[PDB]
Design a protein around this nucleic acid. Sequence first.
RNA 1: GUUUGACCUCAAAUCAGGUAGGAGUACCCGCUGAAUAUCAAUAAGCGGAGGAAAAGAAACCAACCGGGAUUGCCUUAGUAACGCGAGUGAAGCGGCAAAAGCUCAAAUUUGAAAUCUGGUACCUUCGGUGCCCGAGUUGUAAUUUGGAGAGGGCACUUUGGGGCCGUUCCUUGUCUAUGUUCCUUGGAACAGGACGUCAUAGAGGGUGAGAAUCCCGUGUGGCGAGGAGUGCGGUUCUUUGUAAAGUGCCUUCGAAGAGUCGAGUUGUUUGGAUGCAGCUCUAAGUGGGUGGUUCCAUCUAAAGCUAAAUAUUGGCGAGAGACCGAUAGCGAACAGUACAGUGAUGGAAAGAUGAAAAGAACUUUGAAAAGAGAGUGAAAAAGUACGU
RNA 2: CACGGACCAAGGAGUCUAACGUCUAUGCGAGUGUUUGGGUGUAAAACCCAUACGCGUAAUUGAACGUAGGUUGGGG
RNA 3: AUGGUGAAAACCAUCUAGUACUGGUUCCUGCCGAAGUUUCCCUCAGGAUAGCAG
RNA 4: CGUGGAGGUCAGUGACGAAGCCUAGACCGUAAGGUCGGGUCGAACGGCCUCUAGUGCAGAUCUUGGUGGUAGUAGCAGCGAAACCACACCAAGGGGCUUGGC
RNA 5: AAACUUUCAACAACGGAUCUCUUGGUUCUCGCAUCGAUGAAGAACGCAGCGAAAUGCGAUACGUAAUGUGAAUUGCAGAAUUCCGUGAAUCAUCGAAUCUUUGAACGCACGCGCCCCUUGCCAGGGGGCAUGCCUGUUUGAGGUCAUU
Lengths: 125, 130, 108, 71
Amino acid sequence: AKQSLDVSSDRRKARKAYFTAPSSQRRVLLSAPLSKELRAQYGIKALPIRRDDEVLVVRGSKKGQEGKISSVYRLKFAVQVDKVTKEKVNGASVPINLHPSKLVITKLHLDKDRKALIQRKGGKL
Amino acid sequence: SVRKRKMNRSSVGKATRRNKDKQRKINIQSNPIIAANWDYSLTMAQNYKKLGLRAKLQTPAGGKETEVVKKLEELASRSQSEREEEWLEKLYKKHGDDYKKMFFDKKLNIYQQSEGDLKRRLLRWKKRNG
Amino acid sequence: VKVHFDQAGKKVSRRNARATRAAKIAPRPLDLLRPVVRAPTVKYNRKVRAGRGFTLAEVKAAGLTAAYARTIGIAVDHRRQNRNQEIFDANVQRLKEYQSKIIVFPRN
Amino acid sequence: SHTLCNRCGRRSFHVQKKTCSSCGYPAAKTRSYNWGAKAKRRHTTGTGRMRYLKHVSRRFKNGFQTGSASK
RNA sequence: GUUUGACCUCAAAUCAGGUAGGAGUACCCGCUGAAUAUCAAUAAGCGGAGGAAAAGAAACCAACCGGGAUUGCCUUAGUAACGCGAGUGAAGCGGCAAAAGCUCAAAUUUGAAAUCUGGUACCUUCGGUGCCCGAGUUGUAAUUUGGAGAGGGCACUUUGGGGCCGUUCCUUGUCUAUGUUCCUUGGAACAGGACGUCAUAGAGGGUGAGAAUCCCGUGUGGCGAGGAGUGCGGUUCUUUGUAAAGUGCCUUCGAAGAGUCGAGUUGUUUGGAUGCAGCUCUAAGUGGGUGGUUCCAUCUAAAGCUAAAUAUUGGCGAGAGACCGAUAGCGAACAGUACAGUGAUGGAAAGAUGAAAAGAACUUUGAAAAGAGAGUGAAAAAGUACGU
RNA sequence: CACGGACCAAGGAGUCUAACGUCUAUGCGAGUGUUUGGGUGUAAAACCCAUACGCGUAAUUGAACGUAGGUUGGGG
RNA sequence: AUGGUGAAAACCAUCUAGUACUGGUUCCUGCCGAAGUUUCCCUCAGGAUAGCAG
RNA sequence: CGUGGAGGUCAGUGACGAAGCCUAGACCGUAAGGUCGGGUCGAACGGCCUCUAGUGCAGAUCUUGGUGGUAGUAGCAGCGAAACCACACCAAGGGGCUUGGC
RNA sequence: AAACUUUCAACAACGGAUCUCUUGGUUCUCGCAUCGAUGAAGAACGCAGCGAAAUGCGAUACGUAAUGUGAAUUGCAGAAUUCCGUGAAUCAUCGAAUCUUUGAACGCACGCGCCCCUUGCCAGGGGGCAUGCCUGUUUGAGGUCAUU
Ligand SMILES: [Zn+2]
């Protein structure tokens, strides 16, 4: 149960905030858990996802598929995975929109900011 | 109201302020001894009783010294100007301890100080110097 | 038509204000010592009640001055006269007890 | 009978009377009445751009601070 | 002086330093104000402020063994009182919330207008200093505001300013637990069963259908960064000057709001007979105001300031509802928009596809409507005229 | 006679408030009413009451001399 | 009535959801169930009383 | 009897289909209604003791929205309404039920 | 008889009535005071590559300046990025600028003047000149007093 008087459990307010959340907040929203093998390595449960991050599919019809991410659709709250695409009747290939919460990161992309964030979140490298 | 709807529709964004929790919490800011012993878990009356102090002097409405020793222990925790000293020395040399004679000194007692004030100042000077 | 839905809210606000005063006024008891008073209107004269402040005569008899008494938490009322020896004695005893129970920290 | 009004552009500026019945032009005060609750709402503050009033609330939250971030 | 100076008065300057309109308006203050008693100090109109406004420390309430700023609630009380008819309708005392007292006029600083605005150069810049300029004597500072107070003498008591770090408050970032294990179905498991883990965290939201353990989040604490201030604990430099106050005693003095109170009359309000308001007159200092059986009780009006408990359908920001659910709820869930009126003004109708557009590739009949095949899709008995 | 009725989906009306009463139920009982407030609190929730206050407890001055009344009926 | 509009008799927004007889008054079942009148406040206005039914 | 909402209980029902709707299907009750058989539908709803009310429609020349005869008519091969709409030839008895007929 | 009037089972059209839900409305409670000549509210014109409404912006025009986040935005084209980096977002914060014409609206009015200055008779370029009143400086005029 919530004890703070500054936090509201109203369904309407939470729904409005989620849909109207800015891209900066949506970045935090679009988190993805790390693989159990990676969790032991970095000692961290989840981190924000990005383009070069490699992720695995754990739910949906594409369960078991993996590939490098190519775009993070913050507006639609969806992310795209390379080689995970649909086949239209006309032959055009359209990437399938997936939610990061249903995917497991298999190989992170390491930058200075990501390294700093890992240390900040109690991780190790 | 129209303005509220405009603000909600505007992209500027609300100036959110979350301070509801801070109303319940108040930190003591008038004593160092109380702050160390005060417990925010208890109420004002309960905290005063725990410290051993009275939170009300008049009969309160409705139904109802290990720390005071520190407060009691806490209870156990001017000269003359150079020109004033010179003026006192001049009169002392000219009249010594003759306060009555010193009172009537027209050209050294520029300010007509009383005998009591003169003797008190001279005694203070003697105690400070000799 | 006004409905006192805020009664609980008003009580909470009053309690919060009292707590804030205590935080600012921690060492002191938030109240000024008041004298005993006998009411007019014989229907109520039997009842004794607290007054606004002690009279100048009572403060003088208590061994302190009104100006100094105010800084120690004693309410002073120069409008009330004295015409009862028992009430004067009770007020003097209360002031003496207050002086014997108060602790004043050094200004140094 | 009426014409565009510079202050409001409501096309209520009387040609012969040389006055606007809506906003009260050229009178300094803006015409408004309590009984005209809908009229007040139509011209109440917030219906326009609010170029300056919008940022007052944000500025107050910071205590009207001045300078720049220390980085 | 067949002149030259002191002021006072009146004008001007693209003078230097300043402020005023108006907007909003739920609450506040004043004026005015309808549909002889009633709707009524309401509706409407005008002027003036803030986060509250007004009021506020008695020429008070009481006739008691007296209470002692103002304000709000209960009680007093539907009582007293009135219009005694319909009806209007108080206030003291009592209990509660919160409490804070002060500043001028008044009697010589005359052994020193000791006061203050502005210009100039610096510094430690919401200000300080040296100098100058001007205001002030037709009174600027200290000393006194009835609780009295002031000039002296006698035993005594006391004392402030600026920086630093902490402290508190505001803004703001971050760290802080556990499955996505097995089986059944499903397009999707967030559904059922089994096996497990965290819980000061089973409030809430998203994730192809009801998720603590997928994520965002929440409980408790830690770590930061930017501002306020002296509400205070240390830290550091300074005081000073025959400087300012307090205590008890002795001594010499000891001011108090006039076209104001009051009476008369005329308009006005009150359920009060009070008060408000044009005008003739116009009061006294052991004086004046308010109350009763010879008067006795209580204050000192004709000046002003002051947080608190008090209102709040406007503004900003938050926590909630035994509330309503697209013919309801604000007129407006996608609008004060389209639209009508020369105008003041009136003023609507309209929510949902599908997990995702994967929005019907392609063949084929039609100048054009869209048809027939074909396929996508859980479903097209979901085809953008799309939740049923 | 007349008033309304072309048909259908939705909408639609003795509801709320203040005072004064009867009846019924509950609590206490010559006492009663916590909630104007104060304390407390897992927080508009939940639990207690110091002082006052409304009602009644008695009045044609005062009522015990006795079933705070003899007799006759009177559920029992 | 208040405040405005245009025009060389009206219109706009509130007091006003006002001033009372036309119309309507929404689910089922069971039991009981009258009257159109006494006559007092004389009478148009109606109250209180009297009868029926609880 | 029925409905909106709330406290409690069914360790209730439900993608192996909750609600609504349809149904020349059946069961239960004197009825308000409940229940089950079959089709569309898709994600919430119900058995029971209480509390709560913006709680039940056949009309108010009732409000919103929708659709018919009038009528393919008046009217301007084609376009195309409005008023009105409880219902539709007469003899006698009785205002348009009794006995009969063009 | 056919045709046509009428009752019903099925099929085919209207409309969104019933059921489910909402970035909504309404009501209750709490913290604070925050418009303007240093130019308020409001109105008109323009600005995104493509633009109806909304929002933002003012010729520095769906933004410019500064700090935080760290790899986007997205209906289409277009951009890149050294993306191990003083650095993209239509992101957040927001203290520094710009801030078109009107509008208390402020040069004079019911078109249209003046100080200034400048880079080249004459002009581009830049800021101001509205009314009521308070303090100070400058100038001018007029009543009292003095003038051996
Ligand atoms: Zn105008």
